[PDB]
Amino acid sequence: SPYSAAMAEQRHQEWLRFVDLLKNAYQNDLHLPLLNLMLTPDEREALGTRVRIVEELLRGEMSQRELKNELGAGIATITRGSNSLKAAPVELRQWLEEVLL
Amino acid sequence: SPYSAAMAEQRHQEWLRFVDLLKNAYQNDLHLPLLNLMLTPDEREALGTRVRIVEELLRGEMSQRELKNELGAGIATITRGSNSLKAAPVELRQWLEEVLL
Ligand SMILES: N[C@@H](Cc1c[nH]c2ccccc12)C(=O)O
Ligand SMILES: N[C@@H](Cc1c[nH]c2ccccc12)C(=O)O
């Protein structure tokens, strides 16, 4: 059932319903309460850490091992982060270099 | 070590940086690739489902058991959603009723 075409199309629309919800929360300055509701504390912590991983990977100064030890993350976490950043569109990465660095 | 005011301070700074990066991404129409970068596929799926949990809990029509069975979720997931909703500030909750119902 989970691997069906119907379940996949529903999943895509459900995700975008969240994205649009959050867009509107930011517009009405309800983003912080919404994200407190919608996420667990450990998810929020992971997201704060992932920002630093992306930042430091784009910066290119720390090695992936240095980065793991600085953040208390596992090597595999850093590697997933690196894989995802490698796959990101150029337009995002270019912007991230502007705003994160 | 993770259980200190210093680490709580740092975690919040890091979380707010994510929140503000994403705020900025929405302003620049880069939210979609940023969320693809920063979240896993199971995380996005879970967020899409949690929007439905919150929607159906506010609607008040389905029982929590009906909800669990419709979404293929555990009872305890529905319970966590219900707990967070009961604790939500009224401004957030009223706005969710507005936009989701
Ligand atoms: N998009 C990534 C999410 C992710 C996992 N670990 C990370 C570490 C850093 C940055 C992003 C990530 C993925 O699907 O795997
Ligand atoms: N803020 C909630 C996140 C959550 C977990 N499961 C949910 C189900 C529905 C809505 C929100 C949630 C929490 O910390 O537990």
Swiss-Prot record, chains A, B:
GO molecular function per UniProt: DNA binding; DNA-binding transcription factor activity; sequence-specific DNA binding
Protein name (database record): Trp operon repressor
Subunit structure of this chain's protein: Homodimer.
Record flagged with keyword Transcription regulation: yes
DNA-binding region of this protein: 64-87
Alphabetical keyword list: Cytoplasm, DNA-binding, Repressor, Transcription, Transcription regulation
GO cellular component, one term: cytoplasm
UniProt-listed GO biological process terms: negative regulation of DNA-templated transcription; regulation of DNA-templated transcription
Subcellular location: Cytoplasm
A Pfam match: Trp_repressor
Function: This protein is an aporepressor. When complexed with L-tryptophan it binds the operator region of the trp operon (5'-ACTAGT-'3') and prevents the initiation of transcription. The complex also regulates trp repressor biosynthesis by binding to its regulatory region.
InterPro entries in the cross-refs: Trp_repress, Trp_repress_bac, Trp_repressor/repl_initiator, TrpR-like_sf
Source organism per UniProt: Escherichia coli (strain K12)
